[PDB]
C-alpha cells in the first residue's frame, strides 16, 4: 500500500512537469507596467472597544459589518459614517462575521464552537438559529442563499448547514491540520480551503468530495481568495510569499515575494478587474502587488497596528481595512 | 559691547523656549494614541510655557537692552500681570502631576475610576482660575502699592518700569504660588519612593538567587532641577521685602531669570517616553 501510494504521487509530478510549457513572466514580459498607485483615506470609523478580527461588505457596497472581541457587532453606513445597529454577543471571543446576499441576516462565530444567525429586518434583533455541531473553534462563515451557510472549523473539517432545520447536509474531510479560510466561487458551486498543513483543496458542494490538491507553500495558510474569472486563486501563507494557482493547469503559476519583507500575511484580496492583489501584513501596513508582473505599486501605511482583515467593494470603488487598533479605514 | 554678546544669550533663551514647546503641542494633538488623561496636564504646562516665553521674556530683554520703557503706564501693568499669571500657573501643574502619579502608584485598582476626562478638565480649569485670580485682580485693584517717594515718582513717570510691592501682597503671593505645592510634592515623592523600595525588596526576596539607583536618579532629576533653580528667587523675594536694602536689585533680576530658563528644562525632564522620541524623530 505504501509503495502504491508513492508510485501514484510520481504520476502527478510527472504529468504536471510535462505541461509546463513556459513561465508566466516570459508571456507577460512585454506588458507595460501599471506604474505607481497612491490612495488617500476617505473615512475613519470609530466606536470599537478592542481589536477587530472580522469584516464584510454588502451587495449594495454601502453598508458593512465588523466584529470585535469586546462583545459587539456594529453595522456602519460608510457614505455618512453613522452606526445603524449594535448587536450584543453572548461570547466575547469572535473570530468571523458574514453578511447575507439579500441583506436580511448577519452571521457570527468564534471560540464557543457555535455559529449564530441574526435577523436584521425584524428593533429587538435577536438570535434566529444556533448551529452547534462542531468541535474546535470556527475560522470562516459564508452565505450561499438565505437558507445555506458554509462553515470551516478547527478540527480539520468543513460542513454545509441548513438554517431552517439546523442540521448538516454534508461534510468534507481530508485535511490534516486546522482550516483557516475559504472562499465561495462566483457561481457558488465550488469553494476552496486553506489548512495549516501547507496545502489547499477544491471541494464540490453538490458531490461533497475533493477534486484537486495544491501543495506549493511551506508553512501555515491564513487567507485565500478567487480570481474574478473563477479559474484561479491566490493564497497568503505564514511566510512572506503569496502564490497564484491555476485550476485548469493544476500548477503553481507565479510567486510574489520580497527579500525585505520577513513577516506574515493575514489577508488577501483582488481588484474589480483582477489586476491588483492587495495583501495585508504583520508589520502594521498593507501592500499592493501586480497580478501579472509581481511588482509592488504602493504601500498603505496608515495603521498603528497589524492588519487583520481586508475587503473590496463589489463595484470596485473602495478598499476597507481593519486592524487591532479598533479603527476601520476606507481608501479610494 | 556687553549688549551685543548678551543679546544673543537672551535671544537663545527666547528661541529655545518657543521652539521647544512647539514640538510637544503639535505631537499630542496630531497623534491620537498620545491623547491620554495624563498628557492633558503636560499640554497645559506646554501652553503656559509657550505663552510665557512668547510674551514675558522678549519684553524684559528689550527693557534690559534699551535701558528704558516706551509703551507707557498701561502695558507695564499688563506685562506684570501676564508674567505673574504665567509663573503661578506653571508651578501648580507640577503639583497636579505629582498627585496623579501618587494616585496611580499607591492605589492601582481605584485609579481608573477616580480620574476621567471631565475631572481632569475641571481640575485644569480650577488651577487656571486660581492662577488668574492672584495675577490680574490684585494688580488692577492696585493692592500692591508702595509708600515712598521713589515708587510714587516711578508711577508718575511714563518711561520707567519697576516692581514695588508691600509685605502683605508679596507674602500672600509667595505662599499661594510656591510654598504650598512644594510640601505636597515632597510628601508625594517620598511616598512613591517608599512604595518603589518595598516593591524592589519583594522582588529581591522572591528570586534573589538566580538573578535602586534608577529610582534615585529619576526622582533627583525631577526634584533638584526644579528646587535648586526656583527656591533662591522666592527666598530672596520674601527676605528683601521684610528687610531694608539688604540686597541689590541686579541679584533680584538675575535670580528671576532662572525661573524663565526653567521653562526650557521642563520639556527635557518630561516627554521622554519612547512614543515621544519616535514622534520627534518622524517629525
Amino acid at each position: 500500500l505504501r509503495q502504491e501510494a508513492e508510485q501514484l504521487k510520481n504520476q502527478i509530478r510527472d504529468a504536471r512537469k510535462a505541461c509546463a510549457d513556459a513561465t508566466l513572466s516570459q508571456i507577460t514580459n512585454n506588458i507595460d507596467p501599471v506604474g505607481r498607485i497612491q490612495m488617500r483615506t476617505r473615512r475613519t470609523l470609530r466606536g470599537h472597544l478592542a481589536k477587530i478580527y472580522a469584516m464584510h461588505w454588502g451587495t449594495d457596497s454601502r453598508l458593512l459589518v465588523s466584529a470585535s472581541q469586546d462583545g459587539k457587532l456594529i453595522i456602519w453606513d460608510s457614505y455618512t459614517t453613522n452606526k445603524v445597529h449594535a448587536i450584543p454577543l453572548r461570547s466575547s471571543w469572535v473570530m468571523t462575521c458574514a453578511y447575507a446576499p439579500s441583506g436580511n441576516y448577519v452571521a457570527c462565530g468564534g471560540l464557543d464552537n457555535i455559529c449564530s444567525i441574526y435577523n436584521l429586518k425584524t428593533g429587538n434583533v435577536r438570535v434566529s438559529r444556533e448551529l452547534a455541531g462542531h468541535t474546535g473553534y470556527l475560522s470562516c462563515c459564508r452565505f450561499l442563499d438565505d437558507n445555506q451557510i458554509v462553515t470551516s472549523s478547527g478540527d480539520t473539517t468543513c460542513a454545509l448547514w441548513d438554517i431552517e432545520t439546523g442540521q448538516q447536509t454534508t461534510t468534507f474531510t481530508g485535511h490534516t491540520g486546522d482550516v483557516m479560510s475559504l472562499s465561495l466561487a462566483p457561481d457558488t458551486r465550488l469553494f476552496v480551503s486553506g489548512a495549516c498543513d501547507a496545502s489547499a483543496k477544491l471541494w464540490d458542494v453538490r458531490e461533497g468530495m475533493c477534486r484537486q490538491t495544491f501543495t506549493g507553500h511551506e508553512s501555515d495558510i491564513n487567507a485565500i481568495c478567487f480570481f474574478p474569472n473563477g479559474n484561479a486563486f491566490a493564497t497568503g501563507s505564514d511566510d512572506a510569499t503569496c502564490r497564484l494557482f491555476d485550476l485548469r493547469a493544476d500548477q503553481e503559476l507565479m510567486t510574489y515575494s520580497h527579500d525585505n519583507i520577513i513577516c506574515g500575511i493575514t489577508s488577501v484580496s483582488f481588484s474589480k478587474s483582477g489586476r491588483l492583489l492587495l495583501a495585508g501584513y504583520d508589520d502594521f501596513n498593507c501592500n499592493v502587488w501586480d497580478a501579472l508582473k509581481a511588482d509592488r505599486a504602493g504601500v498603505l501605511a496608515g495603521h498603528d497596528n497589524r492588519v487583520s482583515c481586508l475587503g473590496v467593494t463589489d463595484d470596485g470603488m473602495a478598499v476597507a481595512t481593519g486592524s487591532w487598533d479598533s479603527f476601520l479605514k476606507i481608501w479610494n | 559691547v556687553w549688549v551685543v554678546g548678551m543679546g544673543i544669550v537672551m535671544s537663545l533663551i527666547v528661541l529655545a523656549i518657543v521652539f521647544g514647546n512647539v514640538l510637544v503641542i503639535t505631537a499630542i494633538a496630531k497623534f491620537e494614541r498620545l491623547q491620554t488623561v495624563t498628557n492633558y496636564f503636560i499640554t497645559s504646562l506646554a501652553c503656559a510655557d509657550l505663552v510665557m516665553g512668547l510674551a514675558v521674556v522678549p519684553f524684559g530683554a528689550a527693557h534690559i537692552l534699551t535701558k528704558t520703557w516706551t509703551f507707557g503706564n498701561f502695558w507695564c501693568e499688563f506685562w506684570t500681570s501676564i508674567d505673574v499669571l504665567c509663573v503661578t500657573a506653571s508651578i501648580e501643574t507640577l503639583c497636579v502631576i505629582a498627585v496623579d502619579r501618587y494616585f496611580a502608584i499607591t492605589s492601582p485598582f481605584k485609579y481608573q475610576s477616580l480620574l476621567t476626562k471631565n475631572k481632569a478638565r475641571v481640575i485644569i480649569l480650577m488651577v487656571w482660575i486660581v492662577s488668574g485670580l492672584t495675577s490680574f485682580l490684585p494688580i488692577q485693584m492696585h493692592w500692591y502699592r508702595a509708600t515712598h517717594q521713589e515708587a510714587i515718582n516711578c508711577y508718575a513717570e511714563e518711561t520707567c518700569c519697576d516692581f514695588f510691592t508691600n509685605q502683605a501682597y508679596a507674602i500672600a503671593s509667595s505662599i499661594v504660588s510656591f510654598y504650598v505645592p512644594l510640601v505636597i510634592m515632597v510628601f508625594v515623592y517620598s511616598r512613591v519612593f517608599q512604595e518603589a523600595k518595598r516593591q524592589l525588596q519583594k522582588i529581591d526576596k522572591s528570586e534573589g538567587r538566580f538573578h535602586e539607583h534608577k529610582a534615585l536618579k529619576t526622582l533627583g532629576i525631577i526634584m533638584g532641577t526644579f528646587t535648586l533653580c526656583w527656591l533662591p528667587f522666592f527666598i530672596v523675594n520674601i527676605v528683601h521685602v521684610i528687610q531694608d536694602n539688604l540686597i541689590r536689585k541686579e541679584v533680584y533680576i538675575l535670580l528671576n531669570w532662572i525661573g524663565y530658563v526653567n521653562s526650557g528644562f521642563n520639556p527635557l525632564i518630561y516627554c521622554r517616553s519612547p512614543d515621544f522620541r519616535i514622534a520627534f524623530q518622524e517629525l
Binding site: 500500500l1 502504491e4 501510494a5 502527478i12 513556459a22 508571456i27 474569472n229 478587474s273 483582477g274 479610494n332 | -
Partner: protein, 50 residues
C-alpha cells in the same frame, strides 16, 4: 486504504498547457481593465466617497 483510493481519482484528469491559461488570464485582464476604478482614477465629480 483511504489515501490510496483518493489519489487515484486526482491522478487521471484533463490538463492544458500553462501558455493557454496565461493567455486567457492576460486577455481577461486586458478586456476588463477599462472598468476598474482602482486602476484608472475616477473623476472627482463621480466619486461617492469624495
Amino acid at each position: 486504504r483511504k489515501l490510496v483510493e483518493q489519489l487515484k481519482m486526482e491522478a487521471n484528469i484533463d490538463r492544458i498547457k500553462v501558455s493557454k491559461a496565461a493567455a486567457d488570464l492576460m486577455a481577461y485582464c486586458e478586456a476588463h481593465a477599462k472598468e476598474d476604478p482602482l486602476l484608472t482614477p475616477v473623476p472627482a465629480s463621480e466619486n461617492p466617497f469624495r
